[PDB]
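Budget justification note: compute hours in this period were largely spent on complex prediction jobs such as the one shown. Inputs:
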Amino acid sequence: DVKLVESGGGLVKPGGSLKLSCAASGFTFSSYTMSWVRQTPEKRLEWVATISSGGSYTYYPDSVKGRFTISRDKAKNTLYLQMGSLKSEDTAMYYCTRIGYDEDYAMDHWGQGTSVTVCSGSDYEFLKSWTVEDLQKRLLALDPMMEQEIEEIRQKYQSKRQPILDAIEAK
Amino acid sequence: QIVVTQRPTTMAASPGDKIIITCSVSSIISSNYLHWYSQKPGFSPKLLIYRTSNLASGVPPRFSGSGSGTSYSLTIGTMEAEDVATYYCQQGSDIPLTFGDGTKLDLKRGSDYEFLKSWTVEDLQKRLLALDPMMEQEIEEIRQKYQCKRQPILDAIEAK
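Corresponding output:
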């Protein structure tokens, strides 16, 4: 029944802004308190905003106050997070969650997450002086680096699969 | 801020072993405000236990929870290979809402043919398929990393 689908994630510069959305279905949206919770690159879970069922109450942690805004559209069964004054600490997977009971604040359903990456532009300060020829050369050199990192991951997982496959074949 | 501390940070166990994960809270809370979540690698977190001891829907009976005051625990009576995951405790007593850092449960000698050959074919299959969402998560992280690396170079080309 319960479905939560986040969107609006992507790259954003430090100081920029982004708006995340969560389309909810399979339950009566306006009867439930909703939250956003993020997972950092180090895999820590960090609560970032909560909004009460009717929208009257909103709560935030100190590190996010004055920068993020949580809201909901009752007519469209949608939850939003307006993110501003972005910092590197905000790079994370962002999840939309439902709270079952306001008297315990357990989060009984989670979406699939949408990814936000705060991308530093500091290299521009030297790159802006280069010729187009040399910038394209640098850009070209990134593709085989990425392909090599991806192939190494595929090989690592092949190594993990093979003993399981051999165990199955011995049956 | 209520600080939430989990032990161990990481552990490796074998199917059949009892697992206990502890959660320590920096001030006393009611048992109604302590919850547990599991996260399979490559997937989002899912509610496991609420109000200290109540199993969420679909959670099998090998899981249990207890505690009071500042000391709480999660127990898996007999580990199954599908329980490989990270587990998190959370307090819902006051703002800011806070989670423990997580406890990662790994398989002891999980890639050893000698251990694996005694498993059921059903369990070997489940384990095989659990690897693909992990790989895909790692690959997507690399793609995002390189998207960020491209950006300032593209901006510089565009600025001419």
